[PDB]
């Protein structure tokens, strides 16, 4: 019965494939040469940078590194606003709450720990230590000051109540390590890529997987939603990025090049969604034209692999962290 | 500047000095990756152990601070986080000789880390544990592990030396040494072995940087 249902889904997906996105996008002007330059270089991290996240004001950003430090930067002046020492130096993710009042981070300690930035005292303190995951924390993201989704290497994602400090919902169905997480604009759904080479759309309130997406040949390292919320992009160890549509329930576009033979670490869209930016193991970030699947530009100012990247909410700038212990801001 | 911007820049400079001080303090540590099968003597490998995600013990030996990280316990995809320990000075790989069915799992695990892309150039300090229990056990079960190849004498020093050669057969690259040591859990001084191997590794890297190697 499982084989018949899987075949039925394949037949159902094929029926909705009257045309490819390449054909419908054949008669628009190419984006052209996208040349960005390093406008700021943030220095002060002394080890590999694994994650970063912009604040909603598009000026403040948090970065996490293997030196056991979590730094909040003022990108405009390059001022260091806070330097938060971490109990565990094996952080792999960090988050900045939409209000700006909190940041979160976690990693091989299997805990996404919450920090309060705005206290009557002048110092930052730990608010909560969300324990309950069996594997390493790979990604957590705030919905509000009281709710945070986590993804973990134990093949599950969890929605936490920060006040009580326990899982409100546990999202299960992945057969491999979950590596990345991306909340929809409305925060009613989120997508998630894992080491089983598939992506799953989950409903936050009901607790279950709506859709499952396949096509990748290796681990999915990174995932990001399109600004519409009706599609998402994935980045994988098979040197490929793929665009998935939720309503069509299948692949649309593939971003690859024969000279690219290295994994993808991070992905992010532009404000309009026309540019798909991806970090790579070959020490550069490639700017893909999302609609036409053409390479539009390269950011080649890192001496080690680009581990993370993020575009501002106003779309004015993009950040890139790397294993060379530097962050750069590009325009 | 606005005189609040000046105070913010002063605060940023103080944060920078604190970051530099913490970096200077952290730079004098020897980071070591502990590996091996379960019940292979990983935990009780050194007497000094001051400290289910990741366990980090540490000890001081001859004014050198050692940090040993036991990654056994994650039980997840190893390739997704083993790159975190890319900058360790060396790897400590423990093997239980008295376990004749985990000998092949240990040998296969040794290949994976020896031929890792992130550890091609990382030296390994090999510990062959439980030699006291190996000598008393070899008299009964002589040939229950390396069935095809072993056609040598059944002495304690003969099969033990043969097991050692099998592990160092897997070092398929230059600039990496394997420092094999035979240990017994009764009474030993394993900090000297790690300290001596680390000094040799650091001297080798220093000569490589200077160009003499």
């Amino acid at each position, epitope marked *: 019965e499982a084989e018949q249902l899987k075949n039925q889904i394949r037949d159902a997906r094929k029926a909705c494939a009257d045309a490819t996105l390449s054909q419908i996008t054949n008669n628009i002007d190419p984006v052209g040469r996208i040349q960005m330059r390093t406008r700021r270089t943030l220095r002060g991290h002394l080890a590999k940078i694994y994650a970063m996240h912009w604040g909603t004001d598009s000026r403040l950003l948090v970065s996490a590194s293997q030196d056991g430090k979590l730094i909040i930067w003022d990108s405009y002046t390059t001022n260091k*606003v806070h330097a938060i020492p971490l109990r565990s130096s094996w952080v792999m993710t960090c988050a900045y709450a939409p209000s700006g009042n909190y940041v979160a981070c976690g990693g091989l300690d299997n805990i996404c720990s919450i920090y309060n930035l705005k206290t009557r005292e002048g110092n930052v303190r730990v608010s909560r230590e969300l324990a309950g995951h069996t594997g390493y924390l790979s990604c957590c993201r705030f919905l509000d000051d009281n709710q945070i989704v986590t993804s973990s290497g134990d093949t599950t994602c969890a929605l936490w109540d920060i006040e009580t400090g326990q899982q409100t919902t546990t999202f299960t169905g992945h057969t491999g390590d979950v590596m990345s997480l991306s909340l929809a604009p409305d925060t009613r759904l989120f997508v998630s890529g894992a080491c089983d080479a598939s992506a799953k759309l989950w409903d936050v309130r009901e607790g279950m997987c709506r859709q499952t997406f396949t096509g990748h040949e290796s681990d999915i390292n990174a995932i990001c939603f399109f600004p519409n919320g009706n599609a998402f992009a994935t980045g994988s160890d098979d040197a490929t990025c793929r665009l998935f549509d939720l309503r069509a329930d299948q692949e649309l576009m593939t971003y690859s090049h024969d000279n690219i033979i290295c994994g993808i670490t991070s992905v992010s869209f532009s404000k309009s969604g026309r540019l798909l930016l991806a970090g790579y193991d070959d020490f550069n970030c490639n700017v893909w034209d999302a609609l036409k699947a053409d390479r539009a530009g390269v950011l080649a100012g890192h001496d080690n692999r680009v581990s993370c990247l993020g575009v501002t909410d106003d779309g004015m700038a993009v950040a890139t962290g790397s294993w060379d212990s530097f962050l750069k801001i590009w325009n | 500047l606005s005189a609040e911007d000046k*105070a913010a820049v002063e605060r940023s400079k103080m944060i920078e000095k604190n970051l530099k001080e913490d970096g200077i303090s952290a730079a004098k540590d020897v980071k070591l990756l502990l590996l091996g099968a379960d019940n292979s003597g990983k935990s009780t490998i050194v007497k000094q152990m001051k400290i289910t995600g990741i366990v980090e013990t540490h000890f001081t030996f001859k004014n050198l601070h050692f940090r040993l990280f036991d990654v056994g316990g994650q039980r997840s995809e190893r390739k997704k986080w083993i790159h975190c320990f890319e900058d360790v000075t060396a790897i400590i790989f423990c093997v239980d000789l008295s376990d004749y069915n985990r000998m092949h799992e240990s040998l296969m695990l040794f290949d994976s880390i020896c031929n890792n892309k992130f550890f091609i150039d990382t030296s390994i300090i090999l510990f062959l544990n439980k030699k006291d229990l190996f000598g008393e056990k070899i008299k009964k079960s002589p040939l229950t592990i390396c069935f095809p190849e072993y056609t040598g004498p059944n002495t304690y020093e003969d099969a033990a030396a043969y097991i050692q050669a099998q592990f160092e057969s897997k070092n398929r690259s230059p600039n990496k040494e394997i420092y094999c040591h035979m240990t017994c859990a009764t009474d030993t001084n394993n900090a000297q072995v790690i300290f001596d191997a680390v000094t040799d590794i650091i001297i080798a890297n220093n000569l490589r940087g200077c160009g003499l190697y």
Partner: single-chain antibody
Framework: DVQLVESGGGLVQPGGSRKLSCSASGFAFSSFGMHWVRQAPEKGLEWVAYISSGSGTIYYADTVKGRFTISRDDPKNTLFLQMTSLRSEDTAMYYC??????????????WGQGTTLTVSSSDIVMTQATSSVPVTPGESVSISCRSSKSLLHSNGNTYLYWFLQRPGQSPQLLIYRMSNLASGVPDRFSGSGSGTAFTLTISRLEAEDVGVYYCMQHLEYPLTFGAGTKLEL
């Protein structure tokens, strides 16, 4: 809780010397810059001295330069003010104020209860035109303040601060940088202004809104207050 307790003073002869202290408690004292502000009897506030976090920057008002000395003891969580050659003009209630400076911070957010000193016998001008305004509970009020120089800096910030000193109490921050409500302040208070003309609006007056309202600039040192406008019921 945050606490700043000043001590030392009460009566000194002219030409004498006295040392003021301020014991900090309940906050990371080393992270904050500290100020001394004094209030003469039946007069407004006047900034005295400032010492930054780490003691890298020190400033003094012109009326006290050379005579007064501000120092700091971070392990002891204590701030000091050594005064020499005291004059009749130094009779005032001396206040201890914490200030932290980063992007989005709140300087001047907490004041001590003050210590009284009695001596027995270019600069931006802040103009608060009205001196007293009779008010009714439930009515809306609009206090105004003027500045000689434009407080709008090129970085987009307008460095104007509002303080409310209730009868018998130390002043409390209301607005910082001309628009931002301070923590713990009700939403009735609002701040508006442009360059030189500024106003603080109260929507529905309460019995606890009775007191003197001061405007302060922080564009450049020395920090200057305006003669506050009293509100009476």
């Amino acid at each position: 809780d945050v606490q700043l307790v000043e001590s030392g003073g009460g009566l000194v002869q002219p030409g004498g010397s006295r040392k003021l202290s301020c014991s900090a408690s309940g906050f990371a004292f080393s992270s904050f810059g500290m100020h001394w502000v004094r209030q003469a009897p039946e007069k407004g506030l006047e900034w005295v001295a400032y010492i930054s976090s780490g003691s890298g920057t020190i400033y003094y008002a012109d009326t006290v330069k050379g005579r007064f000395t501000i120092s700091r003891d971070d392990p002891k969580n204590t701030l000091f003010l050594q005064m020499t050659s005291l004059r009749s003009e130094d009779t005032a209630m001396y206040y201890c104020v914490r200030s932290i400076y980063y992007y989005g911070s709140s300087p001047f957010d907490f004041w001590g209860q003050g210590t009284t000193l009695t001596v027995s016998s270019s600069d931006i001008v802040m103009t608060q035109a009205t001196s007293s305004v009779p008010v009714t509970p439930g009515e809306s009020v609009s206090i105004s303040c003027r500045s000689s120089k434009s407080l709008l800096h090129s970085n987009g910030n307008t460095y104007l601060y509002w303080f409310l000193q209730r009868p018998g109490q130390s002043p409390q921050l209301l607005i910082y940088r001309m628009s931002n409500l301070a923590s713990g302040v009700p939403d009735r208070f609002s701040g508006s202004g442009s360059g030189t003309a500024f106003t603080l609006t109260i929507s529905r007056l309460e019995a606890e809104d009775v007191g003197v309202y001061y405007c302060m600039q922080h564009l450049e040192y020395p920090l200057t207050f305006g003669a506050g406008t009293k509100l009476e019921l």
